[PDB]
């Protein structure tokens, strides 16, 4: 946008590093890793970001939730600046 | 929940012969085994109308086989119905 549309995303391809490397998706403890799959707030990021497929996120999510109940990961965190 | 091993057992009690796993005889069984299993469940959670549906297929499903078997060998019919103490 404005004359950019800012929606030009050439199917990524070779996605940098695919966001990390080799980390389960049903780890109801492995925070260290999960902490990255969340916006400034415990707001699970969309597909647009991260770098996951169908069944995957269905899991990542199903997990992050299982994590919050363990008090490991956050539901909603405050915003700095702006 | 069951139904994983017992199966063999039902299959083996009805298999019209070493290896028969699909004869009408057997099917009925297997299916009855399931029905009884579901019926039971249905008495506890009486509001699971959906499952109550699957009940009716099988219920009809099994019945149908019996209707086929009943016409294509009354001789084996008596025995099976009777070998499960069924219908009426």
């Amino acid at each position: 946008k404005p004359k950019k549309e800012a929606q030009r995303r050439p199917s990524r391809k070779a996605k940098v590093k695919a966001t990390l490397g080799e980390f389960d998706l049903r780890d109801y403890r492995n925070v260290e890793v999960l902490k990255r799959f969340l916006s400034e707030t415990g707001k699970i990021l969309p597909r647009r970001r991260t770098g996951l497929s169908g069944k995957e996120q269905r899991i990542l999510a199903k997990t992050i939730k299982r994590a919050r109940i363990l008090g490991l990961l956050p539901f909603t965190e405050k915003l700095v600046r702006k | 929940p069951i139904t994983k091993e017992e199966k063999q057992k039902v299959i083996q009690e009805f298999a019209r012969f070493p290896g028969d796993t699909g004869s009408t005889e057997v099917q009925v069984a297997l299916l009855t085994l399931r029905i009884n299993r579901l019926s039971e469940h249905l008495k506890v959670h009486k509001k699971d109308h959906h499952s109550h549906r699957g009940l009716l297929m099988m219920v009809g499903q099994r019945r149908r086989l019996l209707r086929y078997l009943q016409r294509e060998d009354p001789e084996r019919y008596r025995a099976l119905i009777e070998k499960l103490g069924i219908r009426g």
């Binding site: 490397g21 080799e22 049903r26 109801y28 403890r29 109940i69 008090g71 956050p74 | -």
Partner: protein
């Protein structure tokens, strides 16, 4: 009999003696209901992202058990009857979902 995983959080003020006494009871509890502790992992103490029972940190004990399904939701009860026990969450021991890179 299926496997499971029992997560369990406790108070941060407890002394090696108190915790040790609770676990002993957790363990005994499990067994009272056909549970066979396969593993365990005192990863205790971490930085909770939200105060649980007003406390911002907790003991994370993790037990794997091959229980008789029919009891799971009962232990989960008896584990949560203890004051020192803040939260409990049993889950099915689901295969690895290796994924990334």
């Amino acid at each position: 009999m299926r496997r499971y995983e029992v997560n369990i959080v406790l108070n941060p003020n407890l002394d090696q003696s108190q915790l040790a006494l609770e676990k002993e009871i957790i363990q005994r509890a499990l067994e009272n209901y056909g549970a066979r502790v396969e593993k365990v992992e005192e990863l205790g103490l971490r930085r909770l992202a939200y105060p649980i029972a007003k406390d911002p940190q907790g003991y994370f004990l993790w037990y794997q058990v091959e229980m008789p399904e029919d009891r799971v939701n009962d232990l989960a009860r008896e584990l949560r009857i203890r004051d020192n026990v803040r939260r409990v969450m049993v889950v099915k021991s689901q295969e690895p979902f290796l994924a990334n890179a």
